């Protein structure tokens, strides 16, 4: 129940991108109020969704607002990849 | 028709997190300072030209006056182009 979802690649102009979610430095640590991430994203299709987001480089938490939209034009409803806990990315 | 030249970009600043490339990026869309202030703690969509790629891309930055540093972006900005010479 203390699950963390690591934001990976963020497509340009995706719901995720408009919300300001940052590839590989941001982690979704909760909504603003008991549900997991995927059913939340599902159940807020077309509706704004508040999220609490930890960033590793700034080492700090912030509020972010996202509207999932399966019709944004690409894959999914957010247009990002997501990892469980932490995936280790090597900048090359 | 205005353009802003991105200069120095501090490590771990909102501009850095947005992926602003120092000295080669130019904000060419969506004054700029007012727009920054009015988006304190809020994502701002920018259209950015880079001079190595000769291509445009959408960037999203989230200014943060509290980022712990001067301003709320933590980059230097010039109007149009500032002719800096690395020496």
Curated annotation (Swiss-Prot), chain A:
> Superkingdom, according to UniProt?
Eukaryota
**Location of the protein in the cell:** Golgi apparatus, cis-Golgi network membrane; Endoplasmic reticulum-Golgi intermediate compartment membrane
Q: How is it modified after translation?
A: Phosphorylated by CDC2/B1 and PLK kinases during mitosis. Phosphorylation cycle correlates with the cisternal stacking cycle. Phosphorylation of the homodimer prevents the association of dimers into higher-order oligomers, leading to cisternal unstacking.
PDZ GRASP-type domain ranges (all copies): 3-87
Region (Essential for interaction with GOLGA2/GM130), start-end ranges: 78-90
Which family would the database say this protein is a member of?
Belongs to the GORASP family.
Oligomeric form and interacting partners? Homodimer. Forms higher-order oligomers under interphase but not mitotic conditions. Dimers of the protein on one membrane might be able to interact with dimers on another and so stack cisternae. Interacts with the C-terminus of GOLGA2/GM130 under both mitotic and non-mitotic conditions. The interaction is critical for the correct targeting of both proteins to the cis-Golgi. Interacts with TMED2 and TMED3.
Quote the function comment for this protein. Key structural protein of the Golgi apparatus. The membrane cisternae of the Golgi apparatus adhere to each other to form stacks, which are aligned side by side to form the Golgi ribbon. Acting in concert with GORASP2/GRASP55, is required for the formation and maintenance of the Golgi ribbon, and may be dispensable for the formation of stacks. However, other studies suggest that GORASP1 plays an important role in assembly and membrane stacking of the cisternae, and in the reassembly of Golgi stacks after breakdown during mitosis.
Spell out the protein name for this chain: Golgi reassembly-stacking protein 1
Species of the source: Homo sapiens
Gene transcribed to yield this protein: GORASP1
Q: Describe which stretch of the whole protein the shown chain covers, with first residue, last residue and complete length.
A: 109 to 204 of 440
Curated annotation (Swiss-Prot), chain B:
Q: Where is the PDZ GRASP-type domain?
A: 2-82
Region of interest called Essential for interaction with GOLGA2/GM130, as start-end residue ranges on this chain: 73-85
Give a short account of its post-translational modification: Phosphorylated by CDC2/B1 and PLK kinases during mitosis. Phosphorylation cycle correlates with the cisternal stacking cycle. Phosphorylation of the homodimer prevents the association of dimers into higher-order oligomers, leading to cisternal unstacking. Target for caspase-3 cleavage during apoptosis. The cleavage contributes to Golgi fragmentation and occurs very early in the execution phase of apoptosis.
Q: Please state where this protein is localized.
A: Golgi apparatus, cis-Golgi network membrane; Endoplasmic reticulum-Golgi intermediate compartment membrane
The entry's function note states:
Key structural protein of the Golgi apparatus. The membrane cisternae of the Golgi apparatus adhere to each other to form stacks, which are aligned side by side to form the Golgi ribbon. Acting in concert with GORASP2/GRASP55, is required for the formation and maintenance of the Golgi ribbon, and may be dispensable for the formation of stacks. However, other studies suggest that GORASP1 plays an important role in assembly and membrane stacking of the cisternae, and in the reassembly of Golgi stacks after breakdown during mitosis.
Quaternary structure?
Homodimer. Forms higher-order oligomers under interphase but not mitotic conditions. Dimers of the protein on one membrane might be able to interact with dimers on another and so stack cisternae. Interacts with the C-terminus of GOLGA2/GM130 under both mitotic and non-mitotic conditions. The interaction is critical for the correct targeting of both proteins to the cis-Golgi. Interacts with TMED2 and TMED3.
Family designation: Belongs to the GORASP family.
Q: What is this protein called?
A: Golgi reassembly-stacking protein 1
Supply the source organism for this entry: Homo sapiens (Human)
């Amino acid at each position: 129940s203390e699950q963390v979802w690591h934001v990976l690649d963020v497509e340009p102009s995706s719901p995720a991108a408009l919300a300001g979610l940052r590839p590989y430095t941001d982690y979704v640590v909760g909504s603003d109020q008991s549900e997991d991430f995927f059913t939340l994203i599902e159940s807020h299709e077309g509706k704004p969704l508040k999220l609490m987001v930890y960033n590793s480089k700034s080492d700090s938490c912030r509020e972010v607002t996202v509207t999932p939209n399966a019709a944004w034009g690409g894959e999914g409803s957010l247009g990002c990849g997501i990892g469980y806990g932490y995936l280790h990315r090597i900048p090359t």
